[PDB]
Each structure stands twice: as structure tokens, then as C-alpha cells.
Design a protein around this ligand. Structure first.
Ligand code: NA
Ligand code: NA
Ligand code: NA
Ligand code: NA
Length: 329
């Protein structure tokens, strides 16, 4: 039935498509979003009808119980709301890894991964730079550090390019450019009263602007306060070089410069939560030679931005930008 599956996944789930199928060009990129997008009953039918999904949830559950005092298995089965930044972030990465297992069971695996904002932890796990246990650990530490800030920040998506956004916020020292979303959209981050003021200005100047469903201000100066504790608590984190190309959204150079490769260690995660998200540039880089982009999320929020980026550089008739699950049935 898969009422909440994307077309590509549902077709594989029923067996209508052949293994790994999803004309398009070659290459597949898995995109891990940074936003929690829980919807009522998320994963409930998956847990009962998709053994690969259920195995992943089962395998994560012991670490969650002991690393998070929270049961993802019970959230999914009981359709419980994730409450608080810690449950939201921890639940999201569990869903991301379990959904990656689901695609794998139907022959769909990534040739490269992209992590958007906090979704770069999940990307690093799937690329082999971190183990699932290490991914939970990073998520647990960071989310606990951000939880006390709940309600002191937010973000907003604006129908402005990056330089127009920097112009808008020039006189707003507390507001930052948070995400380079596409050539046409940019996310700002900062104190909620000021984000609301900027949303209104964009609308009154005949543009489009929306609040992000988030109650902190990542990718902003506010995060400086948290970086020392990040480096201390994750001091013992020992990552490995990735085995799948990972295009990092943390750095201007996408973490793919000649020479040494990024080390996905405590400093990287402290940097990832503070630096602006180079999502536009990572997608552009990836679309040079990869033609299928799959957002690994509970509800597709990046597929339009992906398509906008790809359309600016490539012939999108040869491309496919899809999600995994969606809140509508
Ligand atoms: Na399965
Ligand atoms: Na897997
Ligand atoms: Na592990
Ligand atoms: Na290691």
C-alpha cells in the first residue's frame, strides 16, 4: 500500500519496477535534510510491511535507549510526537538511516551523499566516515547543547538570492545568511523578532518569505557559544575517511579540495553547526555527473531547491529529483 511513499519508492515496493530502477543519466546522490518533518503515524506502516526498515529501527534502538533515553521504535509504532530539539534531532537521524536501509533493500544505494545542515551527520554515517553509534552521539551532544536555546532563535526561507539576502540583512548584525538554498532562495537565521521583521519586509517589498519550522538559530553567530562544549564532549570522537564521496555543505570548498580530505571529527561538527550551509553549491557540483537526486526524509522539502539549482546549470530533462516519504497520502 505504502500510502506515504514517493512514486519511485512505491513502484519498487510493489515490485512494479526492477531492482534499483527508480531518459535519465547515470549516478545517484542521496540528500540528507537538516529539518525534522515528523508527520502523524510516520513510519508506522513501514515498520510492519518493510523488513529492511524494521531491521534498521531494531538495530538502532539499543543505542537510542542508552544514548537518548528515548525509544524511536515506540515513537514510530505509537505515532508519538517527538518533543524537544533532542528528540527531534535524534528521531530524524534514526529515520534517515532506516530509510537509507529501505532504499538499499530495493537495490538503490548512493554513489555520493550530500548533507544539508544537521543532515550532514547522517551523510557522514552513510558515507562511512562515522558509525551509526557515532552519528547518534554527535546528534545527542549537539542537540543537548542547543536545547536550552529553544525559542531564542529561528530561521526563514526567502525568495531572494544570496547577494540580495546579504543586502537585506546588512543592518542586522544578529541575523546571518544561514543556508544557500538555491540560486533563487536563501535562508536567514537569528532572533525570532528580527526574523519576523525581515519576513515582513520581504513580503512588503513584493517578495515571498516563510518561517522555518525550527526554534533555534543554527548557522549563525549564536552558535559560537556552543563550539567549545562541542569540541570537549566529542573530544573522543574518532572518525574514518569516507568510502563514498561526501560533498560537505559545511565549507566554502565543499570539503573536496585537492590534498587532505575533511576529518569528520569534533571540530568539523562544531564548524558545521555554525557555518552557513553551502547547499546550492553542493548540489551544483553533484549534478555535473550525477543525475538522480533522492531526498532521504519523511517529507520532501528540498526537491524544489534541488531542481532550481540543477535547472540553472544543466538540462533537467535528463535529471530526477525525488523524495522518500511524504506527509500526504
Ligand atoms: Na524492506
Ligand atoms: Na543500510
Ligand atoms: Na554503530
Ligand atoms: Na574509528
Amino acid at each position: 500500500r505504502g500510502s506515504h511513499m514517493s512514486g519511485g519508492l512505491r513502484a519498487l515496493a510493489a515490485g512494479q519496477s526492477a531492482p534499483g530502477v527508480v531518459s535519465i543519466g547515470g549516478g545517484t546522490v542521496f540528500v540528507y535534510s537538516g529539518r525534522g518533518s515528523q508527520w502523524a503515524g510516520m513510519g508506522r506502516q513501514l515498520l510492519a510491511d518493510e523488513p529492511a526498515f524494521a531491521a534498521a529501527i531494531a538495530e538502532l534502538e539499543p543505542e537510542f535507549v542508552a544514548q537518548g533515553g528515548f525509544s524511536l521504535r515506540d515513537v514510530i509504532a505509537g505515532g508519538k510526537e517527538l518533543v524537544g530539539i533532542e528528540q527531534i534531532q535524534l528521531g530524524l537521524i534514526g529515520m534517515q538511516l532506516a530509510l537509507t536501509a529501505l532504499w538499499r533493500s530495493y537495490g538503490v544505494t548512493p554513489d555520493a551523499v550530500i548533507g544539508h545542515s544537521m543532515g550532514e551527520v547522517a551523510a557522514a554515517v552513510v558515507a562511512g566516515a562515522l558509525t551509526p553509534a557515532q552519528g547518534l552521539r554527535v546528534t545527542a551532544v549537539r542537540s543537548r547543547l542547543m536545547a536550552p536555546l529553544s525559542g531564542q532563535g529561528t530561521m526563514a526561507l526567502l525568495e531572494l538570492d544570496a547577494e540580495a539576502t546579504e543586502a537585506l540583512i546588512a543592518d542586522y548584525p544578529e541575523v546571518s545568511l544561514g543556508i544557500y538554498a538555491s540560486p533563487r532562495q536563501t535562508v536567514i537565521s537569528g532572533p525570532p523578532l528580527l526574523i519576523d521583521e525581515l519576513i515582513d519586509k520581504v513580503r512588503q517589498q513584493n517578495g515571498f518569505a516563510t518561517r522555518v519550522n525550527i526554534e533555534v538559530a543554527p548557522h549563525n553567530p549564536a552558535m559560537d557559544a556552543l563550539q567549545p562544549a562541542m569540541r570537549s564532549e566529542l573530544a573522543d570522537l574518532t572518525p574514518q575517511p569516507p568510502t563514498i564521496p561526501i560533498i560537505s555543505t559545511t565549507y566554502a570548498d565543499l570539503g573536496i579540495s585537492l590534498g587532505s580530505g575533511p576529518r569528520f571529527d569534533a571540530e568539523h561538527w562544531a564548524t558545521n553547526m555554525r557555518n552557513p550551509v553551502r547547499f546550492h553549491q553542493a548540489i551544483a557540483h553533484a549534478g555535473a555527473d550525477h543525475h538522480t537526486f533522492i531526498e532521504i526524509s519523511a517529507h520532501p522539502l528540498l526537491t524544489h531547491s534541488i531542481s532550481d539549482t540543477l535547472r540553472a546549470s544543466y538540462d533537467v530533462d535528463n535529471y530526477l529529483s525525488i523524495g522518500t516519504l511524504q506527509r500526504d497520502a
